Amino acid sequence: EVETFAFQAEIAQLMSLIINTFYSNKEIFLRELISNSSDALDKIRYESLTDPSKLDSGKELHINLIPNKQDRTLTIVDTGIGMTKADLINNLGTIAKSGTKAFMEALQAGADISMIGQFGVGFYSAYLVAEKVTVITKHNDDEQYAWESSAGGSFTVRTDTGEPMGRGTKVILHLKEDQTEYLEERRIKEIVKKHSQFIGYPITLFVE
């Protein structure tokens, strides 16, 4: 059973802006996704201070970067708080309608696409490099779900019966044919060092 949803008009417009605008500094997508993972990890860290049983689904708080040259995918895995099915559907737990507005008002006021994260809609910068994005998530209060979208105004949600994660979120970037540089170890290392060198959780770059 696959459910198909329409993006809210402001999100479809934000996604069209990211896909169609000429902007060479595409590498910021990784900073934005690592920042989202760090926010999810802060959230489970905080919640577990009062209820340590919330870490029954996994005590390790980390981020893994997994390139796969054969599948042409870059996967960002975190063991953060995860998202419920409702959260996924409601713009991946973001304030995307009000954030898209504030980002649009900022762009007209002298901002560039790299400031997207300040408006809480940094997730959608994944479409700077990916033709398709799959989000696998597991929250303690819900089952494991897979969100997916190739943009074009719609997304799907289905239960994920493949590899249970325990808790957290997996962002699978199906890279555009001319964005394969983001599968190279030296390029990922460079971007992590430049934009995410002081994240409060271990970032492990997997090798092939």
Per the annotation, binding residues are 36, 78, 97, 123
- The verdict on 30 binding ligand 4EQ (CB under 6 A) reads no
Distances (CA, A) of 58 to 44, 120, 137, 168: 10, 27, 14, 9
Q: How far is the CB of 110 from ligand 4EQ (least distance, A)?
A: 25
Q: Is 37 in the site for ligand 4EQ (CB under 6 A)?
A: yes
Q: Given the complex with ligand 4EQ, which of 92 and 183 has the nearer CB atom?
A: 92
CB nearer ligand 4EQ, residue 108 or residue 132: 132
Evaluate whether 83 touches 92 at the Cβ level (below 8 Å). yes
| Binding of residue 137 to ligand 4EQ (CB under 6 A) | yes
Which stretch, 6-14, 49-57, 79-87, 156-164, contacts ligand 4EQ (CB under 6 A)? 79-87
Q: Label residues 140-172 b or e (16+ Cβ within 10 Å = b).
A: beeebbbbbbebeeebebeebeeeebebbbbbb
- Name residue, tokens 């809210």: 8
Site residues, ligand 4EQ (CB under 6 A) = 33, 36-37, 39-40, 43, 78, 80-83, 92-93, 95, 123, 137, 169, 171
